[PDB]
RNA sequence: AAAAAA
RNA sequence: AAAAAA
RNA sequence: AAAAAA
RNA sequence: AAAAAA
RNA sequence: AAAAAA
């Protein structure tokens, strides 16, 4: 009686996560600058022309990591005015001063843009290896007007921001999934459908992403600022607030699916006294999932510290049984893979079964909701 | 006395259906598409040459295998307005994907319609081969009054749904059976008589039929839906809710028939332990051909999985018992083939002079019903 | 919010819920002669339902 | 003291 | 770590 | 994303 | 382990 | 699989 209190304020200091007072300054990174090119004026030619030959800067095989990270951050953030106001805006990171170089268009440099200092911003700006878009009657993006540049921008920006969903999770599974959304944007008339950059383009950044964290920590923590932003969006951030529903809790399809499945069912085969105590240890997993606040769905992403807290391994029988009544249910989980080392398929099979024995079998936790009588469930056995 | 509870429950799962919960997208076919061609506005000139132009294109030798689906497919759903919409009702195939292309008329093409596009349009529509009306003095029947085109259009129809009857059956045999309801509707006014087409058109119709089964699928589950329609049915779907009449367990006559003679007649030979299994056996059959609902009788017509178990090779003995039974209560039944591997000859015989024996010879299962003395049945006798 | 392109119409999409969507597709197919022009052509439409 | 845990 | 989501 | 709505 | 079953 | 059925 007085052991099941203190059972249940022992599990959930046990999942709590520590409360961070801080060292003073203890634990500091070692920071490396890192190159961000950003438009030295407001005009729309200097941002066109910077877009230019920032695409074709990432795709070659001669640029090194944190050039290839600066120059990603160069376009990530030229849909705003003032770029280098929304810079120094996100970086929280400690492992990373960014530096950040204003860039004016020219007439007499080579690539037509030098550093607001003609032959450093070349030497900064530079076949079948190069990365560019997928068909090559387009050889330059430079536009005039600024709504053509929007749109052609925004066509940059959804195929970047696309790979973020898909990144740290699936990288070699993810090329068949980001055109899918893609088509989203192409019958939605969101992006440019002729501008498709290369798979070759694409995996440049795709390895990037994976590879480093201070480039995944820019790329969630703007998301989470257009997130807050009061009004209508621009129309840039209004498209980047629509990838990023493929980002949120893009890596904890063990416990965001377990959920749905095994708890929000609710087939008898809950009340197991198996399954009693990992719905106890769930029940204060859906507690600390807010209790993270707003950057918990990005938790893998990051790679936070407590990712390992919502692993299945916690829970590897409640995990099961919503393996198992997830194949049934849905024609899309079936192509989700689940192996691990904790896996228990005896209770897999348990799982798969309860959805195949209760098919024509309403509830009595929800007939007495609505008033079905032994006439009405007949009916849908 | 607890071991014959126990078997009655141990013969009924047997025969059950396995309740189909499903696998969750798991086992799709393959998707090939099939031209469907269907009118593009609701005038009566462009439902006509539609009709025109399909009803010779089935003839040729050159078209294909889809191509002969689509164009049945085109005209089997010509009689209601939006044709569209009504093939998307039925397509409940996993083989199948329908694209279907809209048909307009025109004034520059050769064969006169085009594609909502003028020589693909031609190309798809297009001499002793090719198969007609078997009166040569009719070569178009383009019409414009839309009560002529609705008569030539339910004689065109109802001589492709009485195929259906018996085209997995019997299609050698069928052509003698096809004429007997051409006669039918022709002698109630329902269709126009000297449109009648070839034998050799309907030869490709019939051939087309039996091979597939995707048609099939369409054709039955289309009828299912004529049945369904709750007021008086247009003049078409009158038609076609009459010819399936034909349809309706067009292939269970060695199941429809031993019902109808063996268990009905209620001859004394029904007592035999010889039989006492296998009224168990057809007990559980007619309570399963409710089970499977209202697709029961078209289970052979579609080729369902369970019509191997209404098969007469589970109750083969008293099958010929209801086989010599019904050949002398039938002047029709003489002309049944009923050969098959279990066919047990002695049975037949002892089925036979059952008739013969009791010819004059007033029931006792029925005279307490009545009253018959031993006055009144030495009258019949 | 679609009109708008709100950023929240994948929310309301009926990927969130792809059975109980398709059941009510089953529903309103014969409920209603206009919702047989609707086109409801989605990879997560689940036809098992839809017949249920 | 013993296992497993993206 | 894995699926799907106008 | 899809239908219909004096 | 054994047959037959549109 | 097989007949007949305004």
Redesign the interface.
Known sequence: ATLLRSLALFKRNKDKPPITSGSGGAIRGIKHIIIVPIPGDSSITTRSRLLDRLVRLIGNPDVSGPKLTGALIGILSLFVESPGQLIQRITDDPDVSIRLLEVVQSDQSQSGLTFAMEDEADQYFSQSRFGWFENKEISDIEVQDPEGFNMILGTILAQIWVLLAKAVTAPDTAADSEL?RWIKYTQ?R?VVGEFRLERKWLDVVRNRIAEDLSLRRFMVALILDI?RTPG??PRIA?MI??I??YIVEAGLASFILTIKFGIETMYPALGLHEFAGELSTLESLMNLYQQMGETAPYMVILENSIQNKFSAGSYPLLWSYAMGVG????????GLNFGRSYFDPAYFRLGQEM??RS??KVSSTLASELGITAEDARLVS
């Open positions: 899918r939605q969101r997130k209508n969006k209004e607030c629509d990023d529903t194949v049934e249910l849905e024609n899309s989980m079936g959805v195949r098919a024509g």
